[PDB]
Design a protein around this ligand. Sequence first.
Ligand SMILES: *[C@H](O)[C@H](C[C@@H]1CCNC1=O)NC(=O)[C@@H]1[C@@H]2[C@H](CN1C(=O)C(c1ccc(Cl)cc1)c1ccc(Cl)cc1)C2(C)C
Ligand SMILES: *[C@H](O)[C@H](C[C@@H]1CCNC1=O)NC(=O)[C@@H]1[C@@H]2[C@H](CN1C(=O)C(c1ccc(Cl)cc1)c1ccc(Cl)cc1)C2(C)C
Lengths: 306, 306
Amino acid sequence: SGFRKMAFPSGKVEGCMVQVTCGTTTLNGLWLDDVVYCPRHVICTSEDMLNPNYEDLLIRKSNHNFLVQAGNVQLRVIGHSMQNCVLKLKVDTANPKTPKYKFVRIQPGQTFSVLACYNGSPSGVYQCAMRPNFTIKGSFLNGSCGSVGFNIDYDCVSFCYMHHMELPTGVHAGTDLEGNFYGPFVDRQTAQAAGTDTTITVNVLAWLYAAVINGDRWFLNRFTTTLNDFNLVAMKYNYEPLTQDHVDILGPLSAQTGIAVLDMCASLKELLQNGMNGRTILGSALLEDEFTPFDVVRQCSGVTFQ
Amino acid sequence: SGFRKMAFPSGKVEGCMVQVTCGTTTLNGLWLDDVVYCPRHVICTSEDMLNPNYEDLLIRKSNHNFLVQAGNVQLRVIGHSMQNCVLKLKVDTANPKTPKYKFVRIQPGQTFSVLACYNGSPSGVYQCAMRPNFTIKGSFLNGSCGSVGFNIDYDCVSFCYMHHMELPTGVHAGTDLEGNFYGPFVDRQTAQAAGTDTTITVNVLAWLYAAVINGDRWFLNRFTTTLNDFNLVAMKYNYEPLTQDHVDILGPLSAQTGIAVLDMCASLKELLQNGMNGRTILGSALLEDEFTPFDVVRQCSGVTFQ
Ligand SMILES: *[C@H](O)[C@H](C[C@@H]1CCNC1=O)NC(=O)[C@@H]1[C@@H]2[C@H](CN1C(=O)C(c1ccc(Cl)cc1)c1ccc(Cl)cc1)C2(C)C
Ligand SMILES: *[C@H](O)[C@H](C[C@@H]1CCNC1=O)NC(=O)[C@@H]1[C@@H]2[C@H](CN1C(=O)C(c1ccc(Cl)cc1)c1ccc(Cl)cc1)C2(C)C
């Protein structure tokens, strides 16, 4: 037993991480086969980043301007192109550590692991959720751009995020690996704002089921509720609407615990209206919303990756 | 900016993890050079585990009884010995992925990363602290024994924990890599209990400094306090005494923020006496104690590992 915010083992991604320097900008790149992917704002100077014209900036660049460091071995860039907000640097060497992979774009409410990197060297790994407002609550300092987010399924790494910037509230914005931003953000150094967030209701319910599985039962009740009546309470407390597909997705957890989904909704209702009255759930005094039903099933049953 | 519970990149440890099966017990082993380390209770049957005599049990074993799986390659065991509560299985192949390493034993209050493993395959990575009562609040299911805890310093893996068992409160107990248990626990299937825990005061203060660095300031005050007067409050709320060495260790964070250590103690005092009044600190509604001053400095400055 026990329930922890758990990242995927990072080894497969560590072997892909490189350093990209151009001018006086250094960031991280992702090296897969013979391409290095990195944020396109590596081509920017300080006065470029205020409102850059990246097509103009890129045509003025040369292959030799891009210094790519794979550990202590320099990678010769032999071609370069832009795809949306990422650069694709063609190098003369295929990464022998290239895992099997996919470029996927995730939905708000879904989670992934971030391998935070500086100077092409991994620093730490942690779990993030894509917020409903398309930001992520990460831990990123200068130099972390090009760090990626990913999930692992069996032996296959699904890359879903590349880091680009921090917003004024201290949350983080970036792209999928096709270079398309999550949310209404641009890689331009100009006042942008996240936009109002909501709590991921289906995830809170999943975490309540994790708690029950692990012996925390004090918030359970005999009460039940209808889906419609629950959603009137959810809307008031700035929670996302719960759909019938959410109910269906929670089915396995409901069956394992023997607590009907709508019964757990009644419990969440009371927690929302009453608070926790000094008690905790899985070591938290807040309702936690960055575990998906999948995350709970993985951890509370024991899935691995090879 | 941002502050997350962050584990070390796990790649170096992933390359060491193997499957050890003996009889109908399967667990994980740690393969370094030509030795596989694993919990000695792998030699136990169901009626053995109730109160086993491990020396008797081991002399009845043969090298060929130990099936070691390194991925899809079988490792031939050529010798075996017991060291305290771990077994050392001598194999005919040195692990070519052996990182530089050390076997260290950590102190209560210190943190480490756990690579949770099943059937020799890594499942997830997360950060733990050694509680004052020598337990850890982990996430471990059947089959996870032999998973290790570690820190990484530059290129060197300091192994500090091997997982052995869960206690009746759902917390976890294990050994250092010399096979010596943390705390007053034995690898015997008989009623044991954790013993009363305390909150790691110096870590809470470190986390309060992390919060200030990241813009959370509402708990700050003009008040100050003496170390003695603080410790009278700490004792009441079941917090560990703060020592002058703790104050010294917090010096850098104090200097970065410009908040004297004893001033932050005055803030913690009010938080302990008043609670949080509906507010949060770094996304938590509880005072968090599993970040060390080192952890805060690493994350809020950007140290990597190669
Ligand atoms: C890439 O290494 C870097 C990572 C950020 C630094 C601090 N936290 C990060 O995640 N990204 C950037 O430097 C981007 C790129 C120029 C500016 N920028 C920023 O994140 C700064 C910034 C972003 C957005 C706006 Cl509208 C203004 C400035 C920034 C934000 C917050 C802090 Cl604390 C420092 C710097 C860019 C092309 C957007
Ligand atoms: C090793 O894979 C396994 C890991 C534990 C299973 C559940 N959580 C774990 O961390 N460890 C064990 O199976 C140990 C070894 C025999 C019994 N055991 C236990 O952890 C069970 C147990 C421990 C201690 C006592 Cl006093 C009685 C039983 C145990 C505890 C809790 C649960 Cl939920 C299941 C099983 C052993 C030699 C101690």
